[PDB]
């Protein structure tokens, strides 16, 4: 197992994904600074398209609390509904 | 494990979430008053968007019975349907 | 575990819910009469919105056979479809 | 466990349900003739609304092969789609 | 257990179904030729309506590779979508 | 078990499929060059229709990172929505 191989599943909730990411990051043999930079880069890069969209909408400077609270809607009825309606409107 | 990390999954039923929340709260090392305040704040803050919407509509002064009885519709056929129709109407 | 904490899940089939309800009710320390009254009140009170709608439509005087046979449609394709269409008609 | 309590789940496939029905029926203490009559009556009576609709369309005189082969469409994409479209047409 | 009772589930993927079919066929006491004929007849006869539709569209002379590669779309988003749209067009 | 029998499930995420593909590929008795060629041909050939569509759109010269990052949208709300809308537009 490597930190680079941690990718969020398409139907995986964000909290689970970040949990696996941090579990694995606590194991990789690397300096703390490298672990922080890893956090900032990988954590956002390896999310699925929906969560990556929301986080891209948040911009920079957001904490984990803000991100996770922003993403726990994905897959919920309201999210699926809004996304579907927006998709039908686009096409 | 910490009480602050208990967040309701997007597809998780409310009863399960409150079950984990109270199971964990009985373990966190803190005074009884701090545990009650934790209940009031976290329990509502850490729910997913749908349940948070319904509970915000209930307002304050509601008991666990009133909240849970208010939220067990989420994910049910009627709930998903109503949410979908309202979403199509919005866009 | 207490009989008052037995609540039907949003996606839980009715037969399962009544199975848990009676399994738990056979354990609660209470007189037989109190257990019957418990049955009549809780069993209907703690169901989810869809089943509560159907049972409310049945009215009083219905047996468990009539109720369960009335509710095993919930979640089935026909049920979800009919409910969805009615929801679209409402909005 | 009793044969009268075997009911098909709303999302349960037919083959599984008949499997439970025959497994439990093989245990009930009763004469063989009573077990056959049980088969004919309960097996059709305790199915969910969709399968009961299809089997009601088949009528009497059908064997298990004809029924099961008639019902394995339930829940499949084609079934859910057709049912949904017919429901939209009704309303 | 008998080869005649192997039926594809409504939501079962084709690869799994053929896996059970061949696993069981390796157990049934019968000559190799009878097992081949069993393959040709049962394997296609006992599939669910969607897979039976696609395979019927393929016609005869197709190998297992062609069939399985033809059916792995069933249940996928694209399949369910196409089937749903065709269903709405039909009604 | 043989590498030729590794096929992506209809609802299986791509990362899982490639994980099984490489897990099995590390076991098949063959020279390394044959294993690379196996990778290039089978890995893309045995995917389901959606992933095969996206990867076919990518063309040649793409690495595993580009493919996997391209496919983790499959099954996500946005993907299913876009596919559904495009399907309704086609018909």
Residue numbers in the entry:
A (entry chain K), B (entry chain J), C (entry chain I), D (entry chain H), E (entry chain G), F (entry chain L): 148 to 238
From the primary publication:
The Gag shell has hexagonal paracrystalline lattice symmetry, wherein the central CA region makes two layers of interactions through its two domains (NTD and CTD, for N-terminal and C-terminal domain). A second putative switch spans the junction between CA and the first spacer peptide (SP1).
To learn how the CA-SP1 junction functions as a molecular switch during HIV-1 assembly and maturation, we determined the structure of its immature, assembled form by X-ray crystallography at a resolution of 3.27 Å. The CTD-SP1 plate crystals were made up of stacked sheets of flat hexagonal lattices, with each sheet consisting of CTD-SP1 hexamers connected by CTD dimer linkages. Our structure therefore represents a flattened version of the immature HIV-1 Gag lattice. In our crystal structure, each subunit contains the main CTD fold (amino acids 281–351 in the HIV-1 Gag numbering scheme) and the CA-SP1 switch region (residues 352–370). The switch region immediately follows the main CTD fold, and consists of two parts: a type II β-turn (residues 352–355) and an α-helix that spans the CA-SP1 junction (residues 356–370). The CTD-SP1 hexamer looks like a goblet, with the main CTD fold forming the cup and the CA-SP1 junction forming the stem. Underneath the cup, the junction helices form a 6-helix bundle as predicted. Therefore, for PR to gain access to its substrate, the 6-helix bundle must unfold. Our structure revealed a second structural component of the CA-SP1 switch, which consists of five amino acid residues that connect the main fold of the CTD and the junction helix (352GVGGP356). This motif makes a right-handed type II β-turn that buries the Val353 sidechain within a shallow sub-pocket at the bottom of the CTD, which is made of the MHR and 9/10 loops.
